[PDB]
């Protein structure tokens, strides 16, 4: 499935799309990607829209 990550920072706004077999693996993907950017904080997930958000 296609999932999305919304990055909601004070120094960064954006989105990534990634492929993964399910949402636990997409999580693991997106936290690595968020680490690249330096962005961490409150993680949430919208099953309707297969989208994670991370909000600093
Ligand atoms: Zn696939």
Bound molecule types: zinc ion
The CATH topology is given as Ubiquitin-like (UB roll)
CATH level-1 class: Alpha Beta
Give the biggest beta sheet: 4 strands, mixed
SS content category = alpha+beta
List the helices and strands in order.
Answer: EEHEE
Radius of gyration, CA atoms, in whole angstroms: 10 Å
Tally the beta strands: 4
| Helix content bin | 25-40%
Contiguous helical run count: 1
Quote the distance from N terminus to C terminus: 26 Å
Shape: globular
Strand content: 35-45%
Can you tell me the number of structural domains?
A: 1
Spatial arrangement of strands, main beta sheet: 2-1-4-3
What CATH architecture label applies? Roll
Written overview of the protein:
- There is one protein chain.
- The chain is built from 1 helix and 4 strands; from the N terminus they run E-E-H-E-E.
- The chain has one helix at 23-37, and strands at residues 2-8, 13-19, 42-46, 51-55.
- It is of the alpha+beta class and 56 residues long.
- The protein has a single domain, classed as Ubiquitin-like (UB roll).
- It is classed as de novo protein.
- Keywords: Metal-mediated complex, B1 Domain of Streptococcal protein G, DE novo protein.
- The assembly is monomeric.
- The entry is titled "Crystal structure of mutant B1 immunoglobulin-binding domain of Streptococcal Protein G (T16F, T18A, V21E, T25L, K28Y, V29I, K31R, Q32H, Y33L, N35K, D36H, N37Q)".
- The protein is Immunoglobulin G-binding protein G.
């Amino acid at each position: 499935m296609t999932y999305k990550l919304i990055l909601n920072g004070k120094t960064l706004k954006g989105e990534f799309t990634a492929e993964a077999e399910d949402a636990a693996l997409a999580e693991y993907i997106f936290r690595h990607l968020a680490k690249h950017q330096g962005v961490d904080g409150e993680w949430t997930y919208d099953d309707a829209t297969k989208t994670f958000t991370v909000t600093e």
